[PDB]
Ligand binder design. Structure first.
Ligand SMILES: Nc1ncnc2c1ncn2[C@@H]1O[C@H](COP(=O)(O)OP(=O)(O)O)[C@@H](O)[C@H]1O
Ligand SMILES: Nc1ncnc2c1ncn2[C@@H]1O[C@H](COP(=O)(O)OP(=O)(O)O)[C@@H](O)[C@H]1O
Ligand SMILES: Nc1ccn([C@@H]2O[C@H](COP(=O)(O)OP(=O)(O)O)[C@@H](O)[C@H]2O)c(=O)n1
Ligand SMILES: Nc1ccn([C@@H]2O[C@H](COP(=O)(O)OP(=O)(O)O)[C@@H](O)[C@H]2O)c(=O)n1
Ligand SMILES: [Mg+2]
Ligand SMILES: [Mg+2]
Lengths: 227, 227
């Protein structure tokens, strides 16, 4: 869904594409303007998190669908935080879609195509070269990001159902929030109707993706998308 | 593979059957004497662990295939400890069968038929009513059991590849080792040849199960099985 283009030893161009993919790449479509929306929303979320003292890779914008970001030594992880039961959590817990969790759940996934991103725990992570201290710091950050995003979104009639983060290490060996934060990588539900305003619209044919992503953008910024 | 028969409020009969099952119950056979072997080996392992200060449910033997055990409030968990890469670990880590782990891996599985025993982490466990303190105590015990069994077995030319444990709570709220410890619930490899002396013989048609289980029994006790 994104192009990464080097600049020097220090930074990268992160370009968001109009392509959407689901079910291990077996479902595909293109949505004009999706790249733009995902980029803008990432910018907005990264700026919010920075103000709250979250170290992120965001440096700046490079016009349109492109962000300027700090190059990191990436952890091969996808870190999922979950507030409300949806998606794959229904295969691990005998709870219905929409069940409100008594506290957030953090799941670790091994980012590995050959193995299709299997869930892992702290012991697997250690065998992968990720110390317990590092894992603990990663989850601590993910849970803080959760709090800030859910609070900020709740005040806008949006429930943060779950979401995925990625992380890397900077030259100082600090753990820095990376990749993207968009309706591609989060579940957003309208607080009243409880309907999806995210990639689930594309996954399960729930309506128009662009319209749902625009709606998210409008309800967050108070403005209509210019493209 | 086992019958559980109540006695009073305090204890249960644990009866080991000759039935073997694999691949979510899609492969089945009966092996005369398997019940006997599994019972005896469980007794031997529970006695070893008790001597080492592991609290287990073992009370006594009730002749033949039947053990007397303390009734516990069971945790709905299967706790897997792994020393050498085998089985499902090959789908989570890009490592070959027989790879020696730099340290043991503990995996938690939600004992749930509808969901087919999915792997879980500490956060899922908490939603299931299992506190972090409880999980930490459970893994602490599993890792101690690992050390004792692998040491004791290594001195007998047997590598403990991985194994599954189960636990419950007694009336004092102590965490007590439960269920069974047998060639059904462990991977045992001959140290020299590295061949399976466990249920994998039945899983992948590697030879005779009874002969492999007898071999385990003989190499552990120094005596031939009487039945
Ligand atoms: N700051 C960063 N430095 C280096 N790599 C990054 C950074 N942020 C994200 N990445 C990586 O760049 C890629 C972004 O493109 P994406 O479409 O997400 O690829 P993928 O299909 O591998 O997830 C991902 O592999 C992601 O982990
Ligand atoms: N001390 C104990 N008290 C109560 N239940 C136990 C104890 N030890 C084992 N169990 C449970 O009894 C059953 C033993 O029979 P088993 O064939 O293992 O059944 P299952 O197919 O459910 O694993 C299991 O459900 C196990 O969790
Ligand atoms: N490879 C992945 C997997 C999940 N996710 C996101 O992480 C959250 C958890 O998704 P999930 O575990 O239910 O997986 P799916 O339902 O997406 O298959 C969802 O918001 C997904 O959008 C992601 O961005 N990338
Ligand atoms: N339901 C289960 C699952 C695994 N196990 C044991 O736990 C260890 C880990 O097995 P595994 O995770 O590779 O699963 P399988 O290879 O048995 O499918 C093996 O020694 C199994 O014999 C068990 O006793 N009961
Ligand atoms: Mg990605
Ligand atoms: Mg059992």
């Amino acid at each position: 869904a994104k192009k990464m283009i080097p600049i020097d030893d220090d930074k990268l161009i992160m370009e968001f594409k109009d392509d959407a993919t689901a079910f291990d790449g077996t479902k595909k479509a293109r949505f004009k303007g999706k790249g733009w929306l995902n980029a803008q929303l990432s910018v907005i979320f990264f700026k919010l998190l920075e103000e709250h003292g979250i170290k992120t890779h965001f440096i700046g914008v490079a016009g349109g669908n492109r962000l300027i970001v700090e190059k990191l030594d990436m952890y091969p992880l996808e870190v999922v935080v979950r507030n409300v039961v949806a998606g794959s959590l229904k295969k691990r817990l005998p709870l219905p879609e929409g069940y409100e969790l008594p506290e957030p759940i953090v799941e670790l996934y091994y980012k590995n195509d050959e193995l299709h991103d299997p869930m892992i725990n702290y012991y697997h992570a250690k065998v992968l070269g990720i110390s317990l201290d590092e894992i603990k710091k990663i989850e601590e950050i993910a849970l803080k990001v959760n709090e800030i995003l859910k609070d900020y979104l709740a005040k806008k009639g949006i429930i943060l159902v779950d979401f995925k983060l990625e992380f890397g290490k900077d030259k100082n060996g600090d753990i820095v929030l990376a990749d993207e934060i968009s309706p591609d990588t989060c579940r957003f539900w309208d607080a009243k109707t409880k309907r999806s305003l995210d990639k689930d619209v594309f996954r399960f044919d729930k309506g128009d993706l662009i319209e749902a992503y625009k709606e998210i953008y409008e309800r967050i910024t108070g403005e209509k998308p210019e493209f």
